[PDB]
Short mmCIF file of C-alpha atoms and ligand atoms in Angstrom, two decimals:
data_model
loop_
_atom_site.label_atom_id
_atom_site.label_comp_id
_atom_site.label_asym_id
_atom_site.label_seq_id
_atom_site.Cartn_x
_atom_site.Cartn_y
_atom_site.Cartn_z
CA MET A 1 130.74 119.64 120.21
CA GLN A 2 127.84 119.68 118.01
CA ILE A 3 124.61 118.97 118.58
CA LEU A 4 122.62 117.96 115.73
CA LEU A 5 118.42 117.44 115.02
CA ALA A 6 116.84 114.73 112.76
CA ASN A 7 113.60 116.16 110.76
CA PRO A 8 111.84 114.77 110.73
CA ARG A 9 111.60 113.49 114.80
CA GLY A 10 108.67 113.32 117.33
CA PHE A 11 105.23 113.15 116.97
CA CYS A 12 103.19 111.93 114.23
CA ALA A 13 99.43 112.87 113.19
CA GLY A 14 97.96 109.22 114.12
CA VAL A 15 99.53 110.62 117.94
CA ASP A 16 98.39 113.84 118.36
CA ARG A 17 95.14 112.45 117.61
CA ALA A 18 95.04 109.92 120.20
CA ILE A 19 96.11 111.80 122.99
CA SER A 20 93.47 114.97 122.46
CA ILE A 21 91.18 111.75 121.98
CA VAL A 22 91.54 110.83 125.97
CA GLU A 23 92.08 114.85 126.30
CA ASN A 24 89.07 116.04 125.01
CA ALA A 25 87.32 113.14 126.52
CA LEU A 26 88.54 113.73 129.98
CA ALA A 27 88.17 117.17 129.47
CA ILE A 28 84.23 116.72 127.92
CA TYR A 29 83.31 114.00 131.43
CA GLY A 30 85.24 114.57 133.78
CA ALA A 31 88.10 111.91 135.86
CA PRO A 32 88.23 108.65 135.31
CA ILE A 33 88.19 108.20 131.90
CA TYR A 34 89.80 104.15 130.81
CA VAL A 35 92.23 103.98 128.54
CA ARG A 36 93.08 100.33 126.80
CA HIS A 37 96.93 99.87 126.65
CA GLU A 38 99.17 102.71 126.79
CA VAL A 39 96.96 105.08 124.32
CA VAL A 40 100.68 105.49 123.20
CA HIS A 41 104.30 104.14 123.86
CA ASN A 42 105.26 106.99 125.99
CA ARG A 43 105.33 107.30 130.03
CA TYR A 44 105.57 110.27 129.72
CA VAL A 45 102.94 111.07 127.79
CA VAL A 46 101.02 107.81 130.76
CA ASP A 47 101.96 109.46 133.95
CA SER A 48 100.20 112.89 132.06
CA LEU A 49 97.43 111.79 131.42
CA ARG A 50 97.63 109.03 134.69
CA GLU A 51 97.76 112.06 137.07
CA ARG A 52 94.83 113.86 134.53
CA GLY A 53 92.39 110.84 135.73
CA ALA A 54 93.15 108.88 132.72
CA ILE A 55 93.08 105.43 133.74
CA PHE A 56 95.22 102.68 131.99
CA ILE A 57 94.14 98.73 131.43
CA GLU A 58 95.21 95.88 129.73
CA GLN A 59 92.22 94.17 129.51
CA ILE A 60 88.15 95.00 129.40
CA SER A 61 87.06 93.61 132.71
CA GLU A 62 89.02 95.77 134.53
CA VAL A 63 86.59 98.41 133.30
CA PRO A 64 83.41 98.89 135.41
CA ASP A 65 79.84 99.26 134.05
CA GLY A 66 79.12 103.24 132.92
CA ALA A 67 82.16 103.88 131.86
CA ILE A 68 83.71 105.43 128.66
CA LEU A 69 86.72 103.68 127.88
CA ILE A 70 89.12 104.43 124.63
CA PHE A 71 90.80 102.53 122.92
CA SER A 72 94.26 102.87 122.58
CA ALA A 73 95.88 103.73 118.42
CA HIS A 74 97.51 100.86 117.59
CA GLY A 75 94.02 99.27 117.72
CA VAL A 76 92.23 96.38 118.69
CA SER A 77 91.08 93.29 117.71
CA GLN A 78 88.27 92.14 116.04
CA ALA A 79 86.98 90.29 119.91
CA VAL A 80 88.07 93.34 122.28
CA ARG A 81 85.77 95.28 120.16
CA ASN A 82 82.75 92.88 120.82
CA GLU A 83 83.21 92.18 124.45
CA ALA A 84 83.32 96.19 124.78
CA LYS A 85 79.48 96.50 123.34
CA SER A 86 78.66 93.56 125.04
CA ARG A 87 80.03 95.34 128.41
CA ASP A 88 77.32 98.48 126.48
CA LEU A 89 79.91 100.94 127.82
CA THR A 90 80.71 104.50 125.43
CA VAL A 91 83.15 103.47 123.39
CA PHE A 92 85.76 106.29 121.85
CA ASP A 93 88.71 104.47 119.65
CA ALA A 94 91.78 106.23 119.08
CA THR A 95 92.87 103.57 116.57
CA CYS A 96 95.60 105.42 114.50
CA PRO A 97 93.77 105.59 111.02
CA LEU A 98 96.63 103.37 109.56
CA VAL A 99 96.54 101.07 111.79
CA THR A 100 92.54 101.36 110.37
CA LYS A 101 94.33 100.49 107.17
CA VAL A 102 95.67 97.17 107.55
CA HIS A 103 92.94 95.93 109.92
CA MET A 104 90.14 96.33 106.84
CA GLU A 105 92.26 94.50 104.65
CA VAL A 106 92.37 91.81 106.63
CA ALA A 107 89.13 92.05 107.37
CA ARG A 108 88.90 91.39 103.85
CA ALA A 109 90.71 88.67 103.48
CA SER A 110 88.59 86.92 106.37
CA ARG A 111 85.54 87.52 104.94
CA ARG A 112 86.38 86.05 101.57
CA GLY A 113 87.67 82.69 104.06
CA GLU A 114 91.42 83.83 101.88
CA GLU A 115 94.65 83.00 104.13
CA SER A 116 96.42 86.01 105.16
CA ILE A 117 99.69 86.41 106.34
CA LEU A 118 101.33 89.15 108.60
CA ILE A 119 104.93 91.07 109.38
CA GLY A 120 105.00 91.90 112.32
CA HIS A 121 106.53 91.77 116.11
CA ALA A 122 104.93 89.19 118.40
CA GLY A 123 102.68 90.07 121.44
CA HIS A 124 103.11 94.04 119.83
CA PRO A 125 99.77 95.43 120.38
CA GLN A 126 99.10 96.28 117.18
CA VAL A 127 99.99 92.42 115.72
CA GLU A 128 97.34 91.92 118.46
CA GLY A 129 94.60 93.68 117.17
CA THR A 130 95.21 92.94 113.58
CA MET A 131 95.66 89.53 113.64
CA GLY A 132 92.47 89.87 116.02
CA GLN A 133 90.69 90.77 112.98
CA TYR A 134 90.64 87.80 111.28
CA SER A 135 87.78 85.38 112.04
CA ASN A 136 87.12 83.34 109.50
CA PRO A 137 88.04 79.60 110.53
CA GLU A 138 88.06 78.70 106.68
CA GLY A 139 91.43 80.77 106.09
CA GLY A 140 94.36 81.22 107.99
CA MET A 141 96.41 84.12 110.10
CA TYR A 142 99.58 83.49 110.08
CA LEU A 143 102.19 86.04 112.09
CA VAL A 144 105.82 86.74 110.63
CA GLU A 145 109.46 87.99 111.84
CA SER A 146 111.75 87.03 110.11
CA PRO A 147 112.55 85.27 107.41
CA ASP A 148 113.95 82.81 108.81
CA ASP A 149 109.45 82.22 110.12
CA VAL A 150 109.07 82.16 106.37
CA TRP A 151 110.69 79.16 105.60
CA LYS A 152 109.11 77.08 108.09
CA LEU A 153 105.27 78.52 107.72
CA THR A 154 102.95 76.43 105.35
CA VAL A 155 99.15 77.59 104.35
CA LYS A 156 96.59 75.98 103.13
CA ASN A 157 95.99 77.61 100.08
CA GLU A 158 99.28 79.03 98.90
CA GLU A 159 97.22 80.38 94.91
CA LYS A 160 95.16 82.27 97.45
CA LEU A 161 97.59 84.65 100.16
CA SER A 162 98.02 88.04 100.56
CA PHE A 163 99.90 89.30 103.80
CA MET A 164 100.02 93.21 105.81
CA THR A 165 102.79 94.73 107.72
CA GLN A 166 102.41 96.00 111.37
CA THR A 167 103.09 100.01 110.75
CA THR A 168 106.33 100.26 113.02
CA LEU A 169 108.47 98.19 111.26
CA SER A 170 112.31 98.31 110.10
CA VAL A 171 111.73 99.36 106.39
CA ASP A 172 115.13 97.18 105.44
CA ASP A 173 113.88 93.93 107.77
CA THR A 174 110.43 94.13 106.73
CA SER A 175 111.83 93.98 102.76
CA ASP A 176 113.96 90.79 103.30
CA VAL A 177 111.21 89.03 105.04
CA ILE A 178 109.08 90.44 101.86
CA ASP A 179 111.36 88.94 99.10
CA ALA A 180 111.50 85.44 101.58
CA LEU A 181 107.75 85.53 100.84
CA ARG A 182 107.00 85.90 97.64
CA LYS A 183 110.17 83.55 96.64
CA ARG A 184 108.40 81.04 98.92
CA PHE A 185 105.11 82.18 98.00
CA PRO A 186 105.19 83.39 94.03
CA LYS A 187 101.40 84.30 93.62
CA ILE A 188 101.23 86.11 97.19
CA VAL A 189 99.23 89.15 97.04
CA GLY A 190 100.07 92.93 99.02
CA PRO A 191 100.19 96.11 98.82
CA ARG A 192 102.60 98.04 96.39
CA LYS A 193 105.90 98.42 98.90
CA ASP A 194 104.13 97.11 102.97
CA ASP A 195 101.96 99.01 105.55
CA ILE A 196 104.66 100.94 107.41
CA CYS A 197 103.30 104.24 107.63
CA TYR A 198 104.60 107.49 106.43
CA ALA A 199 106.13 108.53 109.94
CA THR A 200 108.14 105.64 110.51
CA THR A 201 109.76 104.89 106.58
CA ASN A 202 110.55 109.00 107.02
CA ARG A 203 111.80 108.78 110.87
CA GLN A 204 113.53 105.71 109.95
CA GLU A 205 115.66 107.91 106.24
CA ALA A 206 115.40 111.13 108.85
CA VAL A 207 117.69 109.02 111.86
CA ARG A 208 120.24 107.52 108.83
CA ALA A 209 121.17 111.16 107.61
CA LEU A 210 121.79 111.76 111.16
CA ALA A 211 123.65 108.55 111.71
CA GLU A 212 125.58 109.44 108.50
CA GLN A 213 127.21 112.86 110.73
CA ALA A 214 126.90 111.92 114.12
CA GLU A 215 129.39 110.12 116.39
CA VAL A 216 126.03 108.70 118.29
CA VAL A 217 123.30 109.29 118.27
CA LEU A 218 120.36 109.52 121.22
CA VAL A 219 116.73 107.98 120.30
CA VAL A 220 113.75 109.62 123.11
CA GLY A 221 111.38 107.80 123.49
CA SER A 222 110.06 104.30 125.61
CA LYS A 223 111.15 101.31 125.57
CA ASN A 224 108.36 99.19 124.77
CA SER A 225 108.03 101.59 122.23
CA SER A 226 108.61 99.74 118.23
CA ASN A 227 108.55 102.61 116.20
CA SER A 228 111.90 104.07 118.66
CA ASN A 229 113.93 100.48 118.92
CA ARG A 230 113.25 101.37 114.84
CA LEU A 231 115.67 104.08 114.94
CA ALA A 232 118.33 103.28 117.76
CA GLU A 233 118.67 100.11 115.60
CA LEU A 234 119.14 101.61 112.33
CA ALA A 235 121.34 104.08 113.31
CA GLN A 236 124.00 101.04 115.62
CA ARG A 237 123.72 99.16 112.40
CA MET A 238 126.11 101.94 110.79
CA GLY A 239 128.12 101.92 113.87
CA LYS A 240 126.91 104.57 115.78
CA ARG A 241 126.18 104.61 119.27
CA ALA A 242 122.13 104.56 120.26
CA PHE A 243 120.51 104.83 122.75
CA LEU A 244 117.24 104.70 123.30
CA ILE A 245 116.43 107.00 126.42
CA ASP A 246 112.49 108.26 128.19
CA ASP A 247 114.64 111.76 128.86
CA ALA A 248 117.54 113.27 129.77
CA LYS A 249 118.33 111.83 132.73
CA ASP A 250 118.74 108.88 130.97
CA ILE A 251 121.69 110.28 129.48
CA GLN A 252 125.08 108.98 131.25
CA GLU A 253 128.10 111.36 130.47
CA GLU A 254 130.73 108.28 129.20
CA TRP A 255 128.44 108.10 126.52
CA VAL A 256 129.22 111.83 125.06
CA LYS A 257 132.93 111.82 126.57
CA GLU A 258 134.64 113.59 124.21
CA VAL A 259 132.27 112.80 121.45
CA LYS A 260 132.33 115.48 117.96
CA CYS A 261 128.86 115.40 117.02
CA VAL A 262 126.60 114.35 118.28
CA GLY A 263 122.47 113.21 117.04
CA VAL A 264 119.28 113.46 118.60
CA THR A 265 115.86 112.47 117.41
CA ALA A 266 112.23 110.78 119.00
CA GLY A 267 110.00 107.95 118.19
CA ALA A 268 107.05 108.83 116.80
CA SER A 269 104.90 108.49 120.36
CA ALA A 270 107.95 111.06 122.29
CA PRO A 271 107.05 114.68 122.80
CA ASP A 272 108.73 117.51 122.45
CA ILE A 273 108.86 118.82 125.54
CA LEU A 274 111.28 116.14 126.04
CA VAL A 275 113.66 116.87 123.39
CA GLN A 276 114.14 120.75 125.04
CA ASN A 277 115.45 119.19 127.90
CA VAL A 278 116.95 116.53 126.14
CA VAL A 279 118.89 118.74 124.41
CA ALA A 280 119.44 121.34 126.95
CA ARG A 281 121.25 118.49 129.37
CA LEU A 282 123.50 117.97 126.43
CA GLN A 283 124.16 121.73 126.15
CA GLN A 284 125.71 121.16 130.27
CA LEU A 285 127.93 118.80 129.12
CA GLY A 286 129.38 121.17 126.03
CA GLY A 287 127.08 120.83 122.84
CA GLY A 288 126.49 124.01 121.77
CA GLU A 289 123.42 124.90 120.44
CA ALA A 290 121.28 122.69 118.47
CA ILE A 291 121.12 122.47 114.78
CA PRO A 292 118.22 121.13 112.86
CA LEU A 293 119.22 118.91 109.69
CA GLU A 294 117.25 119.97 106.75
CA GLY A 295 114.94 116.96 106.50
CA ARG A 296 111.58 115.65 104.14
CA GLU A 297 108.17 117.48 104.48
CA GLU A 298 104.55 115.95 106.94
CA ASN A 299 101.88 117.47 105.89
CA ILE A 300 99.17 114.84 107.18
CA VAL A 301 97.12 115.96 110.77
CA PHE A 302 94.16 113.88 111.64
CA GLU A 303 91.57 115.18 113.23
CA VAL A 304 89.25 114.12 116.08
CA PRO A 305 85.61 112.43 116.31
CA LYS A 306 83.55 115.99 115.61
CA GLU A 307 81.55 114.09 119.00
CA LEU A 308 85.40 115.45 120.61
CA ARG A 309 85.51 118.52 119.60
C1 H6P B 401 100.31 103.54 117.96
C2 H6P B 401 100.90 102.94 116.94
C3 H6P B 401 102.37 103.77 116.78
C4 H6P B 401 102.47 105.15 117.34
O1 H6P B 401 103.82 104.94 118.18
P1 H6P B 401 103.58 103.79 119.88
O2 H6P B 401 105.46 103.76 120.00
O3 H6P B 401 102.90 104.56 120.76
O4 H6P B 401 103.71 102.57 118.86
P2 H6P B 401 105.35 101.41 118.24
O5 H6P B 401 105.74 102.05 117.53
O6 H6P B 401 104.18 101.42 117.75
O7 H6P B 401 104.94 100.48 119.55
C5 H6P B 401 101.26 101.90 116.44
O8 H6P B 401 101.40 101.39 116.62
S1 F3S B 402 100.42 104.32 112.17
FE1 F3S B 402 100.19 105.95 113.69
S2 F3S B 402 100.41 106.21 114.94
FE2 F3S B 402 101.56 107.17 114.09
S3 F3S B 402 103.47 105.85 113.89
FE3 F3S B 402 102.45 105.90 112.08
S4 F3S B 402 101.27 107.63 112.44
#
């Protein structure tokens, strides 16, 4: 069985920085370090950091006075940031810069009292943080997930309206939502295409190329990783069996029985060690040397804050 690897796959710049912020805080200050939400949506990265003394909580009221608190890469609402500020924690912010960029646009629209629409998935933490940049009661902040939600939405002033997106969406699905927004609200303003990040766009482009060669696609990533779920979904819509897996133990041999070409990719929050162990399992099940596909170059790095070097 041929094993193919998508390119690019695995860690993005945001994730690499976020994990280093927690590791470097643990190195500089010792355990414990509190982290609001899973730093990135990857069980191995989270369990790893847990075993090292990071404590993952969901609410600032779970964090003791005097503690060091790190906001996760997904970002936080103003109400969360203000809560932490009023508690006098020591706070470091691991929010990906490309999520902060969207936050600054929502804040700008709130200040202007002009309505904004976010395209994203309800209950995802990045959505909760981005919607939570909008504070002005005179305006409005609305979430839509599909064209159906656009066809139900009414706003106060459609002549002064903007949109933004979550970073880790399907590029194709998000384009359909934007088409519906522009048809319903022709004066809406937004970025040229969407706020989907480079890493999400590139991994989807790479899984499309992978799925055109492979019969079955394995995506290394956790169940609550949006970007990882988009990669498995993209391959399934091409007609390929595709499975989201945390690690090699999740591989069912029936999935690759008499398969001549299996493709492996990984979401932006999945470490390469997991991919290596998945490739070693697939070789136990009859696979050959893993062949990486040619792919679009990534060259972005985001450094940790100076105070955490
Ligand atoms: C931090 C982040 C992306 C990195 O991968 P994650 O898997 O942590 O997050 P997501 O795909 O959005 O569920 C932006 O939400
Ligand atoms: S928003 Fe940031 S954390 Fe990664 S998946 Fe995109 S570069």
